[PDB]
Amino acid sequence: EYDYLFKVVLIGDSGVGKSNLLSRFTRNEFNLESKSTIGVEFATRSIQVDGKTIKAQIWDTAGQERYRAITSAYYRGAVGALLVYDIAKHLTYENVERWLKELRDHADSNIVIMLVGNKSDLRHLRAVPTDEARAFAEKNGLSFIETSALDSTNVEAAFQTILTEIYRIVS
């Protein structure tokens, strides 16, 4: 059982690694041949914070328009969001603005939002400099981290950080 249940949505373009951030976080698995998410999918994991049990209920969503749910109204009740782009594809980062605008059209105003630059293992292919994405996060009131679902770098830290920040706001 648990003391808090935190609904957290994963949003951002198709291919950026949302489902693998989720599989890495919830069962330490990564798959190179990930199937595209259809509609909304789910996984959960419980962690400790301030000595209390926090169940993270993670809503993993489709980034491909032809795979998306008819409506974004399901964002309601979300206390956290990860807005994910691929550091090796500047377009996925350009699209963060639009993901972000939609989120704030449907989400509660206290939602905690973390901008996540995924695939940091692809250093040789980087298209989004860290400083650029960080200034965007700052200016938009987003927290910010770079992760790699592949080599696991900062995945634990991204989720632990957002869940801890949510705990501080709601407790």
């Binding site: 996984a43 008819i70 964002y75 309601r76």
Partner: protein, 382 residues
């Protein structure tokens, strides 16, 4: 000149260590079948190695083989098989008892193979084990009878488990909103608790893990069909909201599987129709592109099923619309190359054929001893 036999000369028996055999007197056989099969309750055997009843039976058979007593062999087995059947007709609704005798029947079968004498069943024996093999008798025909029995028993185990789960499925899977932002009753936790109980029973009794994996593959198949079939009848649950709820429910079942190391059972795969139905409910349903996305994605739903769900689809906010006739016809035209079944509903009672593994063990017959609680003191070690 004569000799009556006289110190009256008598045939004395050689004094040797435990061979791991078990002899009994023909007159005492009903007491044996009675205390070892008929009146034996699974729970008396807590705190011993699983399937001790099967080992004990093979040890008795072994001795019978050794005295060359084929009347004993036939008697014992024929009588044991009938005992077990009788216990199962009486306990036809008892999951624990049924699984108990499945497990033991299978181990007795493994013993008869492992110690058959056929070198093909023996590749994994230690020398000590090889010398516990049957010497005189080839019991192939009985092995066949035991294999037939275990299938009958497995079917009764599935029947029992499905009977318990049935009244729970629709309510848990379709009639219980348990996550936020989407807007006799059972919840999904109660199905999961019931499956834990089944799993624990099967584990505690040392059922072959391949059989356990198959049991849950089979029960998940049932949840798939029962849930999908109810959804194929009802407008009130065909909305995007149910789609998401259902997907969440399915993911909890999947995580349960992983937690019990059951994820490779094939169970997940049997849910693909229900998963696709859940996705279908969530997807856009207006344009040509939308219809192509649906036809590409719904490979485990028949055309009739996809059409039924689109026909049933009922928005929950007036701000959304019912699927149009033209949209359905577009689906129908796109799905023409298909060869789907004539019947709309899935057969919820479909049984996957069970494959029973052969799992020889490292137990040595000459280290096995009967616990007093079985009241088999009238058995004697040889």
């Amino acid at each position: 000149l004569y000799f009556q036999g006289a110190m009256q000369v008598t045939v004395q028996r050689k004094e040797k260590d435990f061979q791991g055999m078990l002899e009994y007197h023909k007159e005492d056989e009903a007491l044996l079948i009675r205390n070892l099969v008929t009146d034996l309750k699974p729970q008396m055997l807590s705190g011993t190695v699983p399937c001790l009843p099967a080992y004990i039976l093979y040890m008795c058979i072994r001795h019978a083989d050794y005295t060359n007593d084929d009347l004993k062999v036939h008697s014992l087995l024929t009588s044991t098989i009938n005992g077990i059947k009788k216990v199962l007709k009486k306990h036809n609704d008892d999951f624990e008892m049924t699984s108990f005798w499945l497990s033991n029947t299978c181990r007795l079968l493994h013993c008869l193979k492992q110690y058959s004498g056929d070198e093909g069943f023996m590749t994994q024996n230690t020398a000590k084990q090889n010398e516990h093999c049957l010497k005189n008798f080839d019991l192939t025909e009985y092995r066949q009878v035991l294999s037939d029995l275990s299938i009958q028993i497995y079917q009764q185990l599935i029947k029992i488990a499905e009977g318990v789960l049935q009244p729970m499925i629709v309510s848990a899977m379709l009639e219980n909103e348990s996550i936020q932002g989407l807007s006799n009753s059972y919840c999904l936790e109660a199905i999961i608790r019931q499956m834990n109980a089944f799993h624990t029973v099967m584990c505690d009794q040392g059922l072959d893990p391949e059989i356990i994996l198959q049991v849950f593959k089979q029960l998940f198949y049932m949840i798939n069909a029962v849930t999908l079939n109810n959804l194929l009848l009802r407008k009130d649950v065909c909305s995007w909201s149910t789609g998401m709820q259902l997907r969440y429910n399915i993911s909890q079942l999947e995580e349960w599987l992983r937690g019990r190391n059951l994820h490779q059972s094939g169970a997940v795969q049997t849910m693909e129709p229900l998963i696709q139905a859940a996705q279908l409910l969530q997807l856009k349903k207006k344009t040509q592109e939308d219809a192509e996305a649906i036809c590409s994605l719904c490979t485990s739903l028949s055309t009739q099923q996809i059409v039924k769900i689109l026909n049933l689809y009922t928005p929950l906010n007036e701000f959304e619309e019912r699927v149009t006739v033209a949209f359905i016809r577009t689906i129908q035209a796109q799905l023409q190359e298909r060869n789907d079944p004539q019947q709309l509903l899935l057969d919820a009672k479909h049984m996957f054929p069970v494959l029973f593994p052969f799992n020889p063990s490292s137990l040595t017959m000459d280290s096995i001893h009967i616990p007093a609680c079985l009241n088999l003191e009238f058995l004697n070690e040889v």
